[PDB]
Design a protein around this ligand. Sequence first.
Ligand SMILES: Cc1ccc2oc(=O)n(CCCCn3nnc(CCCCC[C@@H]4SC[C@@H]5NC(=O)N[C@@H]54)c3F)c2c1
Ligand SMILES: Cc1ccc2oc(=O)n(CCCCn3nnc(CCCCC[C@@H]4SC[C@@H]5NC(=O)N[C@@H]54)c3F)c2c1
Lengths: 321, 321
Amino acid sequence: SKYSQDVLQLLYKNKPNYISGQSIAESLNISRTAVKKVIDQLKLEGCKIDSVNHKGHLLQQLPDIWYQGIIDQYTKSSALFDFSEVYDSIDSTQLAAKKSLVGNQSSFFILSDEQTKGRGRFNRHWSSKGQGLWMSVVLRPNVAFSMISKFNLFIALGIRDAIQHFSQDEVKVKWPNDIYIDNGKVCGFLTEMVANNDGIEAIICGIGINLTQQLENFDESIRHRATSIQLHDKNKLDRYQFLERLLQEIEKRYNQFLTLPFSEIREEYIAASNIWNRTLLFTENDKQFKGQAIDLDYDGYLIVRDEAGESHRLISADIDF
Amino acid sequence: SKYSQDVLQLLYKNKPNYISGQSIAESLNISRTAVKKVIDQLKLEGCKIDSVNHKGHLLQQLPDIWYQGIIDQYTKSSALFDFSEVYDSIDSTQLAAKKSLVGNQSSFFILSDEQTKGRGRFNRHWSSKGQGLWMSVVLRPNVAFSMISKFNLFIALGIRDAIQHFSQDEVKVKWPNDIYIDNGKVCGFLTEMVANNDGIEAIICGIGINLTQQLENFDESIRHRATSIQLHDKNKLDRYQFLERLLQEIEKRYNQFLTLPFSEIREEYIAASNIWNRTLLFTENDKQFKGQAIDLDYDGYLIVRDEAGESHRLISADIDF
Ligand SMILES: Cc1ccc2oc(=O)n(CCCCn3nnc(CCCCC[C@@H]4SC[C@@H]5NC(=O)N[C@@H]54)c3F)c2c1
Ligand SMILES: Cc1ccc2oc(=O)n(CCCCn3nnc(CCCCC[C@@H]4SC[C@@H]5NC(=O)N[C@@H]54)c3F)c2c1
């Protein structure tokens, strides 16, 4: 409805108090009966809303659907993000972000319940409705373009922390672009930039996180190597609580990226990684080789000793277990 | 008119032969009288068209206006460019290019007679109708993002050569981003990219060239340091001939960029530069200093000895004479 988001936003703003239908009606300049109809539709879409005669309405719980009016409250109080765009379905949050950043210096993010053309690294296929967080973040660091790599390392730890807050099981980073919970890939992200020789015009970080998929919801080919946050959380995973936590952690790590050399988080990163003490398969255009991760150095390069005993120093790699 | 571009394209395709009105009418499935009206309007817009009873029409000369139908013939025979977009007016060819490249791997260029929001380096103001070439080129080199700097060096020589073909006076490059004809800035360009750690998604090269401005057409504040190609060409500068030459040279230098190390053009570059043997003013965020250009090294870095005797090695700089 035209006013569904405004009513939802009023309900969210007023937790933990009940708000009367009349207060909503006056706030939006519509009748009591249009408020009641909007609230009925919200309950029909899966809003858990307690209604009490003479007292009004209390939003208790949101469904597994993104609502622009709620996310507006997230950006309103954000020192980092100017706005968000929220979609039920699009081709890709990353395509949208790359278009929306042109011609302005706004920091913002784009969320979609579903992507019809989700793309990962190397143009690989990735995005079902209701089961995952599909998000692109656009930021404006005043730094040289060579700093993209370090951004990628900082943001990994923020994403890992946010997921770890909801998982009873250990959450690890696979350098440089994925997150795992006990052999199951729960998240992929990729950092892209627009830049020139004078500096970066935008960072676009694309983040895809499996939230509520049950094993039955993964292809039988990938079930053993894929997982969702819900499969490691004894409690219902609430996507809004999770998003709030993810944005706090993104901001924390972005400010670290702007203020700290990577050598100051390198030990934490190494201890959060699951690439050690195992044979790794590296793909590099037309050539593939096996090797071992020896170190992650002060500049974020992975130090590798390959099967033939030769050392490599890689800013990035395409790694399989 | 709906068919003005199709008729213009037929006339251009048929040089050096005359084409009859009937042949155009049959080609486009319209009447002789609509062909005659279109041709009258083309002549009114400044098309020099010879019409001869019983023989037909010969396009002899185009006005100082960009026509999509002509540029289509330029991209049709190009091994490099898939298409172009041609505008009478837009905010910026570079904004448009950055939007049009999202979600595809096409190579293309964007031309506008006028820009209302032309922007150079550091968001500086730059774009009058009828007097200049305002163009953005989008290319798809399969290379690492650190290669942007070398692209910038190769393209400089192509732009310089194209201008030099029409100027009786020596044309020089001011590293890293401008072209001069005897103390007059005739061109600015800037190379930008979209990239991630796995490689470049697009090069966007924005090129602005003063073509036909007379000194009266420059602000009185910049007249002594600004120039146009026309002011150094005893012959009428024809913008289409010039564009054709500029695109040949862009392609030549792009293929060099893809195949040669910079050390193979470094000597030519040094001999084409006008930054030697003079005091230069460098601006670097909040600090400014004076210095001398000592060398351009094998990697494209400018070697500078500053006024205090300290050496600097700069991938890029903000330089004034
Ligand atoms: C979690 C999970 C588990 C098992 C999987 O078996 C799969 O086949 N897949 C999909 C492909 C994952 C490979 N990949 N490529 N690039 C990356 C890193 C970048 C991924 C793109 C992230 C976001 S999604 C929102 C935004 N809008 C886009 O179009 N991209 C970005 C990968 F992990 C499996 C996946
Ligand atoms: C020729 C000429 C002579 C005298 C001048 O006195 C001036 O004030 N100006 C304008 C500013 C020139 C400084 N500049 N900044 N970045 C650069 C390099 C990048 C310039 C942008 C080029 C293209 S134009 C098509 C495309 N679409 C855009 O928005 N940008 C690009 C500069 F030379 C004078 C200029």
